[PDB]
Amino acid sequence: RAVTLRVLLKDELLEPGEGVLSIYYLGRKFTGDLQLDGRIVWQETGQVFNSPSAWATHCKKLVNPAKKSGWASVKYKGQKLDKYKAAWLRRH
Amino acid sequence: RRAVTLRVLLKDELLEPGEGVLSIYYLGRKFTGDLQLDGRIVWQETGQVFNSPSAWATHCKKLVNPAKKSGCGWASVKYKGQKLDKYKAAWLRRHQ
Amino acid sequence: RRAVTLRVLLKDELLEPGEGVLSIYYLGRKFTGDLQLDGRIVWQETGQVFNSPSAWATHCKKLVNPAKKSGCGWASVKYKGQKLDKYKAAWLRRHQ
Amino acid sequence: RAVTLRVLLKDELLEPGEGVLSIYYLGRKFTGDLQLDGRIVWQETGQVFNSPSAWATHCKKLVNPAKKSGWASVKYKGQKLDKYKAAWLRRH
DNA sequence: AAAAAAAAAA
DNA sequence: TTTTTTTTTT
């Protein structure tokens, strides 16, 4: 039963909002809005992403195109999404 | 593919950055903010920087009514006396 | 949820299997069929097997009248002198 | 506009009838009646299914309960339903 | 009719 | 992990 941002928002481990997702890589700050459907809006361009890993690999490739590869890079209100994946596996 | 943000509204030149251009009117209270080129907002009173219209709106309204719950603050924020949500609507039509 | 078939009629014991039990009378001509426990029909003349009373009814009527167009054969088929459609109605009554 | 047995029947790709739909799985032969509304009646039990997939997963789970999973399994007068799906996409 | 939740497969 | 598409539900 693979864990998605949709499960988390539904099972209330997360709350949707503007500029609640962030990535720091080699000096560039990326900020993301979380929609109720769990899709991510990159503020800078408004381009929509389906998964943390989609958004993270797009952003990191802009800074270092050699970077081949989500839940460890993307933070939600100061904490990594993995801790929110973990939290859910413990509740369910 | 693409959703509206303050930064998308700045790139399409639908909005212009500057001092006191943003405003909220809530229960006889007026809050004014500055719009930055990077789409972030500065609340004039504290000089505090917010990352969203929501985040600034939820914060200001919490100071006048402490039982004010979180939600989308595009509906309550004006740019030069007109509703942000109209700039969103203008962009959505502009780019069908 | 549920709809009538020869097999549902067999389960509810509304029909008994056997030789010669089925019959069609079309333009002064008679055809007879055996009803199997699996609900398939055997045409006595050729020993040919059909999935439904329809399939059998259109095949037999097309030999006496090559125009006759396809459709539901329940209306035309008799089980021991009574219309198969009466066994359908008697089942629907019992169940609903 | 996703293709259903109703569309095929309505657009005359399929003809409704008794014992016109069939499945063969591990020795069990299943036979279906196609209704004008595009719903499937399973001859053996008279139980009514809304989709080829609903009928196929039900019948097969009876043979092999570890089979989790329509248009490839269910045949119409000797050919697979997917061929009638493909035919409609060309005709429309 | 739309809106949203699910089994392989790379 | 994610990316895919039919179907049930309304």
Author numbering:
A (entry chain C), D (entry chain A): 63 to 131, 134 to 156
B (entry chain D), C (entry chain B): 62 to 157
What did the article's authors report about this structure?
Recent research has identified the Mpr1/Pad1 N-terminal (MPN) domain-containing protein (MPND) as a sensor protein that may recognize DNA 6mA modification in eukaryotes. Moreover, the Mpr1/Pad1 N-terminal (MPN) domain-containing protein (MPND) was the first reported protein containing the RAMA domain to directly bind to DNA with the 6mA modification in vitro. In this work, we investigated the first crystal structures of the apo–MPND and the MPND–DNA complex from Mus musculus at the atomic resolution. Our results revealed that MPND possesses multiple functions, such as binding DNA and interacting with histones.
We used different MPND truncations with dsDNA to generate stable complexes for crystal screening and, fortunately, obtained the complex crystal for the fragment (residues 54–163). However, as the DNA recognition by MPND appeared to be sequence-independent, and the DNA bases were averaged in the structure determination, the final nucleic acid density could only correspond to 10 base pairs. Therefore, we modeled the adenine and thymine into the electron density. Among the four MPND molecules solved in the asymmetric unit, only two MPND molecules were involved in direct contact with dsDNA. However, no specific protein–base interaction was found. When compared with the apo–MPND structure, the orientation of the N-terminal loop changed upon binding to dsDNA, and R63 moved over the major groove of dsDNA. The overall conformation of MPND between the apo- and DNA-bound forms was found to be similar, as demonstrated by the structural superposition, with the RMSD of all Cα atoms being just 0.8 Å.
